[PDB]
Design a binder for this molecule. Structure first.
Ligand SMILES: Cc1ccc2nc(C)c(-c3ccn[nH]3)n2c1
Ligand SMILES: [K+]
Length: 214
């Protein structure tokens, strides 16, 4: 039994359906209980929340779903009419994330895309009717942060003000991505520190707002 399975089972047994906050808490509670290092957790969750509230995106792209914690986190704050597109390379994680969202009552707002970002990002404009993204949450594989950022620019998916929020830019680290956005005039960058338990290490998120092409 994978951890994602066990998490979903726990949520379905303890949280309240259509109550996104209770789903998030049950995930946080269980993971804590089992001492599993969380992919996001509530503290980073609070940073994601503030970014969503601050920019009120109508169309969000999430790279990496895992058990669907961040998807529930983001979808619950989206306005009616808004969409979250979530890319997940692992079919089994995709399946869990769908169930998680169904249970939270948020499935209407989310489209799960199963596959690698390098395969799926170029399909956005036409297959999923995307003009430009309002926000991108990067939480997939470290070595695809910078290439996917370049790919999103190339596909014309970013506009001035598009908010890229990247997780784990310190641990395990995305230094090349950071060097790129902090040094590019195409981005305005803010850093948010946050602590990873068990490893007991300060990690961080980078917020990088697209300014348009150079
Ligand atoms: C290694 C690697 C390459 C490409 C890619 N695209 C996505 C969405 C993911 C992923 C990571 C976690 N969940 N999904 N991914 C992982
Ligand atoms: K910059």
């Amino acid at each position: 039994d994978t951890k994602e399975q066990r998490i979903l089972r726990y949520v379905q047994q303890n949280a309240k359906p259509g109550d996104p906050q209770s789903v998030l808490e049950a995930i946080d509670t269980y993971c804590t209980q089992k001492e599993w290092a969380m992919n996001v957790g509530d503290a980073k969750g609070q940073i994601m929340d503030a970014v969503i509230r601050e920019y009120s995106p109508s169309l969000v792209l999430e790279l990496g779903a895992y058990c669907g914690y961040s998807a529930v986190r983001m979808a619950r704050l989206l306005q009616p009419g808004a969409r979250l597109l979530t890319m997940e390379i692992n079919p089994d994680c995709a399946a869990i994330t769908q169930q998680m969202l169904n249970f939270a009552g948020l499935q209407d707002k989310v489209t799960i895309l199963n596959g690698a970002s390098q395969d799926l990002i170029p399909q956005l404009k036409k297959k999923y009717d995307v003009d430009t993204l309002d926000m991108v949450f990067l939480d997939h594989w470290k070595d695809r942060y910078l290439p996917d950022t370049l790919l999103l620019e190339k596909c014309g998916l970013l506009r001035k003000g598009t908010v890229l929020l990247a997780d784990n830019v310190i641990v395990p680290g995305t230094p090349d991505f950071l060097a790129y956005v902090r040094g590019s005039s195409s981005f305005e960058c803010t850093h948010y520190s946050s602590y990873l338990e068990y490893m007991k290490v300060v990690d961080g998120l980078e917020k990088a707002i697209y300014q348009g092409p150079s």
